Design a protein around this ligand. Structure first.
Ligand code: VJ9
Lengths: 237, 300
């Protein structure tokens, strides 16, 4: 069934599972036309498919050509997502295929269930967690590869960098969701925090800066401050 | 006009014959039902006064044999049986008719209700849904489960309705996932009509039989089947015009006949609102939409 605060450690057991987030699949800019009407222009998007135990991210880039000549694009986007997740599963060796797929939005359940009929033993699950994966396009290297794509493309990343050498999956996921929640609540501030000290760099093969253990504690504290703040700035408290 | 005589009535029971019903008291001198119209299937059904649990009954067609009812004190129910001795049966019935111990099937001449509810229902198809080949009539009751209910437990006592499942490989062509799920025309027309039912008459017959079992016995799996067969048509963008026109008539008479007080349990809010207001056929069921809005506007 649904994934929530009560069965949270299930994410870090040894049953392969993937989160699928479709927020950034269909992206548009809204603009005025010469006649003064409104129109949309699609921009490249991506499916965010993440193994929360290992950090492996299957970033399927959705090029704007997939929408050409199609109607009802927000509905199509959910089915395109399910098509691409199903194709990813079929592409993996049997022993790497997930036992569960957790969708971050309930509207993905029927599209994914229908595309996965061939896999009756893979459980498709919703979640009650409000996960911040929409903020993935605030990660500069992810945004860059999506915007530069000229054709459909899958790009593989480890969203934890090398953190698992020093910390557990549970802790790594908690750091990731704290970072993304901050980026979602106040992107400018969050990004200032992450880069303020130019002596800490991002390795070419990494997404995040090379903080020491002690610097991650300070970073993490600054992100909590931002989130609580913004929460005040918002509701006035 | 045919007759289903009753050996006796040893326990107090409400007896139904099609859409009619009457109360019989314990050991009342009741000996059956006469003037039953030839040309239709019929159902004779029972609810004991002491145990309203288990409505049960028998689907039959008097053209197929001479059937009678007898009370079995061991199994505790009124059983339908077939009399092979046609002379014994003519003799038994005439005797009952002369002593005026039979109720008359009370059809008003103007009234086409039963025809309209059973237009496509055939006894030979009933006997494939309800498997008991040694009898020419078919027993149904409130508790019997359907084949599909059993997949999700005694198979001899099941309702073998055609399995309909919108999230199944049978319903969804590889490579047409979105198309077939949002427009079920290929499942309706190719899989079900051309493949399984062979024609729309057999499809409507099963739909009508499922409704009648839901209504007369409160059979939950029959209600599920009825709604699934409605939803499969309404969720298809491409349906023959004659099928839509006939479906409107079928459903109109079903909604008209439904007891006003049973709408809460026999009508699925989601299906009816989808079918009348969202589906491809939202504008194709004028008679059904009008009676639903005037009789059950709460559900909608
Ligand atoms: C084997 C003994 O047969 C009966 O008792 C019998 C048979 C046919 C029939 F119509 C009726 N009846 O009461 O209606 C009774």
């Amino acid at each position: 069934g649904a994934m929530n605060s009560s069965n949270y450690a299930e994410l870090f057991n040894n049953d392969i599972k993937l989160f699928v987030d479709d927020t950034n699949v269909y992206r548009v800019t809204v603009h005025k036309t010469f006649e003064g009407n409104v129109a949309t222009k699609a921009i490249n998007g991506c499916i965010f498919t993440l193994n929360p135990k290992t950090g492996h991210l299957f970033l399927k880039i959705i090029h704007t050509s997939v929408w050409a000549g199609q109607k009802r694009l927000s509905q199509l986007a959910k089915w395109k997502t399910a098509e691409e997740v199903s194709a990813l599963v079929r592409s993996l060796p049997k022993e790497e295929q997930p036992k569960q797929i957790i969708v971050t939005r309930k509207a993905m359940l029927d599209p994914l269930e229908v595309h996965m009929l061939d896999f009756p033993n893979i459980a498709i699950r919703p979640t009650e967690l409000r996960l911040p994966f929409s903020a993935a396009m605030s990660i500069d290297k992810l945004s860059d590869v999506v915007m530069k794509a000229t054709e459909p493309q899958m790009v593989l990343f480890n969203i934890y960098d090398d953190w698992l050498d020093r910390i557990s999956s549970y802790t790594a996921f908690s750091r990731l969701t704290l970072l993304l929640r901050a980026l979602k609540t106040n992107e400018e501030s969050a990004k200032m925090i992450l880069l303020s000290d130019p002596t800490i760099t991002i390795k070419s093969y990494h997404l995040w800066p090379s903080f020491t253990d002690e610097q991650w504690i300070t970073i993490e504290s600054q992100m909590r401050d931002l989130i609580l703040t913004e929460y005040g700035r918002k509701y006035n408290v | 006009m045919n007759t289903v005589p009753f050996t006796s009535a040893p326990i107090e029971v409400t007896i139904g014959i099609d859409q009619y019903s009457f109360n019989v008291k314990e050991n009342q001198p009741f000996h059956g039902i006469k003037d039953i119209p030839i040309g239709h299937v019929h159902v004779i059904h029972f609810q004991h006064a002491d145990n309203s649990s288990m409505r049960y009954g028998y689907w039959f067609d008097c053209r197929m044999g001479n059937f009678y009812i007898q009370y079995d004190p061991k199994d505790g129910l009124y059983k339908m049986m077939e009399e092979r001795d046609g002379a014994k049966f003519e003799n038994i019935v005439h005797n009952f008719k002369e002593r005026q111990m039979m109720v008359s099937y009370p059809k008003i001449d103007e009234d086409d209700t039963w025809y309209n509810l059973t237009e496509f229902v055939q006894m030979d198809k009933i006997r494939k849904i309800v498997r008991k080949d040694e009898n020419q009539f078919s027993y149904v009751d409130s508790s019997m489960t359907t084949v599909q209910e059993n997949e999700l437990s005694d198979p001899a006592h099941s309702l073998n309705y055609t399995v309909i499942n919108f999230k199944s490989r049978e319903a969804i062509r590889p490579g047409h996932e979105m198309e077939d799920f949002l427009d079920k025309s290929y499942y309706l027309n190719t899989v079900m009509l051309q493949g399984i039912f062979k024609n729309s008459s057999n499809y409507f017959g099963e739909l009508q039989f499922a409704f009648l079992n839901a209504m007369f016995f409160g059979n939950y799996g029959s209600s599920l089947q009825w709604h699934a067969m409605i939803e499969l048509i309404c969720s298809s963008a491409t349906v023959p015009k004659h099928m839509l026109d006939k479906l409107d008539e079928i459903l109109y008479y079903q909604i008209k006949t439904l007891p006003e007080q049973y709408s809460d349990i026999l009508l699925n809010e989601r299906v009816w609102n989808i079918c009348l207001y969202s589906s491809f056929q939202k504008n194709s069921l004028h008679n059904t939409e009008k009676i639903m809005e005037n009789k059950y506007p709460e559900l909608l």
